[PDB]
Structure formats: C-alpha cells, structure tokens
Write an enzyme that holds these catalytic residues in place. Structure first.
Site, PDB file in Angstrom:
ATOM      1  CB  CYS A 228      76.096  16.648  41.449  1.00 30.01           C
ATOM      2  SG  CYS A 228      77.479  15.865  41.993  1.00 30.01           S
ATOM      3  CE1 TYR A 272      78.716  17.174  41.881  1.00 26.66           C
ATOM      4  CE2 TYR A 272      81.149  17.290  41.978  1.00 26.66           C
ATOM      5  CZ  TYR A 272      80.027  16.673  42.368  1.00 26.66           C
ATOM      6  OH  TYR A 272      80.373  15.310  42.847  1.00 26.66           O
ATOM      7  CD1 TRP A 290      81.147  15.987  38.947  1.00 23.72           C
ATOM      8  CD2 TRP A 290      78.863  15.691  38.521  1.00 23.72           C
ATOM      9  NE1 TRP A 290      80.689  14.670  39.300  1.00 23.72           N
ATOM     10  CE2 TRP A 290      79.434  14.546  38.938  1.00 23.72           C
ATOM     11  CE3 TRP A 290      77.550  15.844  38.259  1.00 23.72           C
ATOM     12  CZ2 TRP A 290      78.488  13.231  39.407  1.00 23.72           C
ATOM     13  CZ3 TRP A 290      76.754  14.718  38.446  1.00 23.72           C
ATOM     14  CH2 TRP A 290      77.124  13.476  39.099  1.00 23.72           C
ATOM     15  CE1 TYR A 495      83.437  15.914  46.610  1.00 21.81           C
ATOM     16  CE2 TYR A 495      82.352  13.913  46.050  1.00 21.81           C
ATOM     17  CZ  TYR A 495      82.547  14.744  45.440  1.00 21.81           C
ATOM     18  OH  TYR A 495      82.036  15.458  44.398  1.00 21.81           O
ATOM     19  CG  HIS A 496      79.314  13.237  48.326  1.00 22.24           C
ATOM     20  ND1 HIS A 496      79.227  12.072  47.524  1.00 22.24           N
ATOM     21  CD2 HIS A 496      79.283  14.389  47.583  1.00 22.24           C
ATOM     22  CE1 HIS A 496      79.345  12.208  46.167  1.00 22.24           C
ATOM     23  NE2 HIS A 496      79.188  13.689  46.132  1.00 22.24           N
ATOM     24  CG  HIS A 581      78.970  18.577  46.093  1.00 27.40           C
ATOM     25  ND1 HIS A 581      77.646  18.020  46.098  1.00 27.40           N
ATOM     26  CD2 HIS A 581      79.610  17.713  45.637  1.00 27.40           C
ATOM     27  CE1 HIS A 581      77.657  16.823  45.532  1.00 27.40           C
ATOM     28  NE2 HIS A 581      78.874  16.535  45.158  1.00 27.40           N
TER      29      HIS A 581
END
Ligand code: NA
Length: 639
Positions: A228, A272, A290, A495-496, A581
């Site tokens: 992240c 993030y 985050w 996601y990811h 992300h």
C-alpha cells in the site's frame, strides 16, 4: 487460497505418463483421489535423476481446458515440491507448441494452480523444470484439470490473451526495471497477505520476459513492508517506494545495481497516497490515510540529491478530498497526480474538483475547476484511472471508478482533460460515449500508438471479492474518439491487480486478492498482445528494428538520431511505469516529430520542457506505415 477458473474434469478414463516413478510413488498416485498418495520420481536406490520431470495426461477425449491444480505431497516432507514449471496442451500428443502457462510456485504445501485461456485439448503435460529447494525429485499428491463451460475462438483483430505467468506471490505492486527490462513485483511481508505484518519485510519477485524466469527475493535491508505505498521513478531513474505497511519509510530500488537502498523517512506517515515525479526529478506526495493515522496529510517533497523529505504544508490536501462515506481514511487516497510544468503537480481527481499543486516555498494549491462535460459535472471516481496519452498536448484520459472506495457502483464516465499552464483551468470534454463497461479497480496503460488499453475491474467495488467482473478489455483511439472492445480474458482482475506496458509493446496484467485464506488470490499474470503486432492472417507481423541510436542519454531539448531497418512512419516515447491500486503516475507518452534524414535515418527532438518530458527512463518505439511497433529502445532523459 486460490481457485481454478473452471470445473474439474473426470479422471475416469485418463491415461498418465511420467518420466520416473518410485514403486509406491507411481504415476497414478497423482490421480487417485487420495491426498495421502503421491507420484515421486526415482530416489535413492533407483538413483536421483534431476529435473525436468514430466507428467503427461491423455484425457482420451478433447476438453475445453482452462486450468490445472497441483496438490503437493501432504506428508510434512518438502521433497519434490515444484518450483519452476511449464504447462502444455496438445490435441495429438506429439505437437505441444508453446507453454500455455509457466513461472514458479511458492515453496509450500498449498494447492498450486495454473489458470489459462480456454483451449481445446486432449493431452496435458506439466513440466517441473525445478524443485522448490534445488533437489532432483518431483512429487505430486493430486493433479486435476479444469474445463470451461464452453469454448469461443478469440475474434480476429481484437488482440490475444496469453500465456499465463505463474508466480509465487500476488503481484499487487509492480514496476518495470528500466535497465533490465524485468517486471518487478512485490506483495507484502507474505506472498499472499498483508494483514498482521510485523513490518520490515517485503517479498518481491521478478519476471524476465526474455528468459521467462521468475526470480524471488525478500527485502529487509530497507526495513520496509512496501504494501500500500506511493511509487514514483525519480529524476534519477530510481524507484521511490513510500509508506504503506511501514508508514514512514522510503525504500529506493536502483535498477542499475539491482539493489534496494533505504531512503529518508517521510515527514508524515502515509498509506495509499499517490506520489508523482516533478519536472526537476523530485517526488511529491500528498494524502494517504490508509496507514499512519487518519488526518489531513499535506504535501511533502523528496529531493533525490539531498536525500531529504521536506514538508509543504500549504500544499493542502483539503481541496482534493472526495466525499467518500468512510471519510478521510479513503477520501485522500490514490490521487490522479501528474508532474507538470515548473515544479507543478496537476491533480485530475478522483475528486470532482481538480487542483494545481505548486512546490515553491512551503507549497500551494490552486483550484483548476471541476471535471465536467456537456453531460454534467462528473462525480467522484475513486479508483478510476488517469492516463496522459499525449504529454505534448497535455492530454489526459480519465475513466471508470466509483463515488466510494467500495460498496458503490462503478461509472462509464470518461473524460479528456487538456492541460495548459499551471494555474489555468484545463479544458475537459466527455470521451466518446464513455466506456462500454462500468468498472472500478481496473488498470490501464498508454500504448505506443497513443491508444489507451483498459482492463479488468468490476461493476461494483467489493475488495477481495471476484464479483461483477469485466472480462472484456477496451481500447480508446484518440484520433477517432472511439472505444473498441477487445477479446475477453478468463481471469478476474479486481482489487489489487496491476497492468504495465512491456518494452516489447505487449501488456503485462496480473494480481488481485492478497487476502490470505480467501479463495480470491491470483498468483499470476497474463500477457495481452495488441492487434498492432499481428498481420491480417492472424500471424505476428514483422517489426521495424532500430539498428542505431546516436545516444542513450539525452537532455530535455536534445536531439537523437536513429537508423532503422525499414522506413518508419511514426515514433513515440513512453515513460517507464510503476503500478499499484489503480495508480500509475510514471507512464506518459510523447508523440515525436521525425526528421527524415534519408536512407532510413531519422532525428527527433525531445521536448525542451522537463514538465512534459519528465526526467527518468523512457522507451522509444518506431512504427512502420502498417502501424507495427518496434521493441523499445531505452533512453534516459535528464534535465
Ligand atoms: Na494421490
């Protein structure tokens, strides 16, 4: 956990072949239905034959194969655990062709899979090239093959997916190593999870397109769990990784020496956030709640020269915040940042409000208006993408995303933003009629020709869940102001996931998951080959070659001369990307104007504005009249 993309095939009628098998460890132990019994290659008294080792299956009939599972020996012993492997399909048993999947499996006793695009086949073959620990054997408790519900030939002219690259980790963060041409991927403290990290460790893995070797490496030297984070390629060509699991750390990856170097700690702890390289090679960052707490996290700037992080408190995060329901924890994440002219940073969203960030003195932020069109003011587009496909005209294409980070419906909205001088209100219009498919958590890359490839995502954002997937990629053709659907893929990328342009002009798409026990981890990636690499016959087109470059390091304003093997019609420079992300602040394209020097010799000037031609590494691509791109030449652009 992971999962196969299809349904297990009945092993009734199967016929299996092995290179070796120790009595008791017979081929068929692998397809018996007993996790306690496994096939094992010769050992001890039979000798220790080194790999490759091979497992061939004759399904007797033709099935729409889409995957395989390999359950390792579950007896507490590691011997025979497959590392490097290759999977092949055959309709005849003699002609196998190219592997449908290859890479490496993590050294553990979990079931490993190979998910690949559907292909009709009667014979399957798994080649164990290496043993997880460098041992000679190969063992498999159980082996399964999956089939798709149906087979639909990819349509001609719409690119092709494949092969699949199997990896030891979920590549949730990736970068292209500029010097090597390798794809560098990282996960967290673990290969399949981030939660519960003691921090200070990061598993990384590299894929070499040239050799197809997946090499893994644990990084602890920087005492950072790089999950992240902020990623930016600085003016020097070093990848700056910031925060995330170790919220204040900075780690520097030097492609040149293939090394990880500790950087200065940021002033503010973040997770993030987005970071963007500036016209002077410096790195600017803002937000990131985050991790490191949830509060207003103003800008700070990194100087690769002094190796310091300096706070820019008047470069206020407040005006860029979305109206996310979960509040600030999400509202300051993954800003659409672009380094522009004169140390400025442009913030294109996700917030409806666009802003100008300045880095002089203690910083500043000025409103650049709202993302809008004749169709209205655009709403927050958290996890939408933003691509600068023409840095000379300051053109940025924005698309997808949703109002909230999750539990929200994705949009089809797409806009073109045209930047001017820092401080001015950019022009924004709608892109064609928007995406064919609403999506969030999708990824995108700007291709050599100026088109944007968009893939993956889901219609409704639900991290770690493979629901409402979009398997049909789209390409936006700026010249036509049109979106074109491409052939669909078979593996969900939500996601990811990540996408990166490879130096050969193909797209590397992978990841998704990283939720430990979940069945939504995807320890793989696939290659998308755009139609520009094929001729009408569906075969690969012949590519112009760059026989010569006058230099491999140029200053902004600089001239480069090249010789090619064929007459070239177009040329473009593409900055090396980094991705995580949905964010990729490093990639951008510069369309070049070529001076035809006769004799298939050409010259071009690299823009004199370092805010256009951001310093760092770039890929040079030439196109023939046919539109076929060469493989890239790497050029270092210095200010
Ligand atoms: Na078995």
């Amino acid at each position: 956990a992971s999962a196969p993309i299809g349904s297990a095939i009945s092993r009734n009628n199967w016929a299996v072949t092995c290179d070796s098998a120790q009595s008791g460890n017979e081929c068929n132990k692998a397809i018996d239905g007993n996790k306690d019994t496994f096939w094992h290659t010769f050992y001890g008294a039979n000798g220790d034959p080194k790999p490759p080792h091979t497992y061939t299956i004759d399904m007797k009939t033709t099935q729409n194969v889409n995957g395989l599972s390999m359950l390792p020996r579950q007896d507490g012993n590691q011997n025979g655990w497959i590392g490097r492997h290759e999977v092949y399909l055959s309709s005849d048993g003699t002609n196998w062709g190219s592997p449908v999947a290859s890479g490496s499996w993590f050294a553990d006793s979990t079931t490993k899979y190979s998910n690949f695009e559907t292909r009709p086949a009667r014979y399957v073959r798994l080649v164990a090239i290496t043993e997880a620990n460098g041992q000679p054997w190969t063992s498999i408790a159980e082996i399964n093959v999956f089939q798709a519900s149906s087979y639909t030939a990819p349509q001609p002219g719409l690119g092709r997916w494949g092969p699949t690259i199997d990896l030891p980790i979920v590549p949730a963060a990736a970068a292209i190593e500029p010097t090597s041409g390798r794809v560098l991927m990282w996960s967290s403290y673990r290969n399949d999870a981030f939660g519960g990290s003691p921090g200070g460790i990061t598993l990384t893995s590299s894929w070499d397109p040239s050799t197809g070797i997946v090499s893994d490496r644990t990084v602890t030297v920087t005492k950072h769990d790089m999950f992240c984070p902020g990623i930016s390629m600085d003016g020097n060509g070093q990848i700056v990784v910031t925060g995330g699991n170790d919220a204040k750390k900075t780690s520097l990856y030097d492609s040149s020496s293939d090394s990880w170097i500790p950087g200065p700690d940021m002033q503010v702890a973040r997770g993030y956030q987005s970071s963007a390289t500036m016209s002077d090679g410096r790195v600017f960052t803002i937000g990131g709640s985050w991790s490191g707490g949830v509060f207003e996290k103003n800008g700070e700037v990194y100087s690769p020269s002094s190796k310091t992080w300096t706070s820019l408190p008047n470069a206020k995060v407040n005006p860029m915040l979305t109206a996310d329901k979960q509040g600030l924890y999400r509202s300051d994440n993954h800003a659409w940042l672009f380094g522009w002219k004169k140390g400025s940073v442009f913030q294109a969203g996700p917030s409806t409000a666009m802003n100008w960030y300045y880095t002089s003195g203690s910083g500043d932020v000025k409103s650049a208006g709202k993302r809008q069109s004749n169709r209205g003011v655009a709403p927050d587009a958290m996890c939408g993408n933003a691509v600068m496909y023409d840095a000379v005209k300051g053109k940025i294409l924005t698309f997808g995303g949703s109002p909230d980070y999750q539990d929200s419906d994705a949009t089809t909205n797409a806009h073109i933003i045209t930047l001017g001088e820092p401080g001015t209100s950019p022009n924004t219009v709608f892109a064609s009629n928007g995406l064919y498919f609403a999506r969030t958590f999708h990824t995108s890359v700007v291709l050599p020709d100026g088109s944007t490839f968009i893939t993956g995502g889901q219609r409704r954002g639900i991290p770690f869940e493979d629901s409402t997937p979009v398997f049909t990629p789209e390409i936006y053709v700026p010249e036509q102001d049109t979106f074109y659907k491409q052939n669909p893929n078979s593996i969900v990328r939500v996601y990811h996931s990540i996408s990166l342009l490879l130096p050969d002009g193909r797209v590397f798409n992978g990841g998704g998951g990283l939720c430990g026990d979940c069945t939504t981890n995807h320890f793989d990636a696939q290659i998308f080959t755009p139609n520009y690499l094929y001729n009408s016959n569906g075969n690969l087109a012949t590519r112009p070659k760059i026989t010569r470059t006058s230099t491999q390091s140029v200053k902004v304003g600089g001239r480069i001369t090249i010789s090619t093997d064929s007459s070239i019609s177009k040329a473009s420079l593409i900055r090396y990307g980094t991705a995580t992300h949905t964010v990729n602040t490093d990639q951008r394209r510069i369309p070049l104007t070529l001076t035809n020097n006769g004799g298939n010799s050409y010259s071009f000037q690299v823009p004199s504005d370092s805010g256009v031609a951001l310093p760092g590494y770039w890929m040079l691509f030439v196109m023939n009249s046919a539109g076929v791109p060469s493989v890239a030449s790497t050029i270092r652009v210095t200010q």
